[PDB]
Amino acid sequence: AQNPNCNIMIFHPTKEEFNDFDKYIAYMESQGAHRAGLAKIIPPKEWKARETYDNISEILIATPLQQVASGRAGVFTQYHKKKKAMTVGEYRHLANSKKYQTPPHQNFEDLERKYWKNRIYNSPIYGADISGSLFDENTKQWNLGHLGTIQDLLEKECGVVIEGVNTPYLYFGMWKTTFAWHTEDMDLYSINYLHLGEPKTWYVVPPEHGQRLERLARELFPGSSRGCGAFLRHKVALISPTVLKENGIPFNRITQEAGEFMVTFPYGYHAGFNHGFNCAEAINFATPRWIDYGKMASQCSCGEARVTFSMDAFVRILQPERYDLWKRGQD
Ligand SMILES: O=C(O)CNC(=O)C(=O)O
Ligand SMILES: [Mg+2]
Ligand code: NI
Ligand SMILES: [Zn+2]
Question: What CATH number should be reported for the domain holding residue 53?
Answer: 2.60.120.650
127 CA from centroid of ligand 3 (Å): 15
Phi, psi torsion values for 195, nearest 5 degrees = -70, -45
Atom of ligand 1 nearest to the CA of 184: 10
What does the alpha-carbon distance between residue 25 and residue 41 come to, in Å, rounded to a whole number? Answer: 10
User: Considering its fold, how many domains does the chain have in total?
Assistant: 1
What are the angstrom distances between the C-alpha of 20 and each of 25, 27, 141, 253? 9, 11, 8, 28
Q: What is the Cα 177 distance to its own chain's centre?
A: 13
Domain boundaries, position 323 = 1-331
Burial class (CB in 10 A: 0-12, 13-18, 19+), 149: middle
* 3-state SS class at 270: strand
279 labeled binding residue: no
**CB of 76 closer than 6 angstroms to any ligand 1 atom:** no
DSSP 321: H
300 labeled binding residue: yes
Q: Which residues contact 52 (CB under 8 A, 6 or more apart)?
A: none
Atom of ligand 1 nearest to the CA of 190: 10
Name which residue sits closest to atom 2 of ligand 1, judged by CA.
Answer: 179
228 labeled binding residue: yes
8 Å CB contact between 170 and 281: yes
Atom of ligand 1 nearest to the CA of 270: 7
**CB of 271 closer than 6 angstroms to any ligand 1 atom:** no
What does the alpha-carbon distance between residue 147 and residue 141 come to, in Å, rounded to a whole number? Answer: 10
Q: Which residues contact 118 (CB under 8 A, 6 or more apart)?
A: 73, 176
What does the alpha-carbon distance between residue 247 and residue 43 come to, in Å, rounded to a whole number? Answer: 36
Structure determined by? X-ray
Q: What is the Cα 325 distance to its own chain's centre?
A: 26
Phi, psi torsion values for 201, nearest 5 degrees = -95, 135
Question: What is the resolution in angstroms?
Answer: 1.1
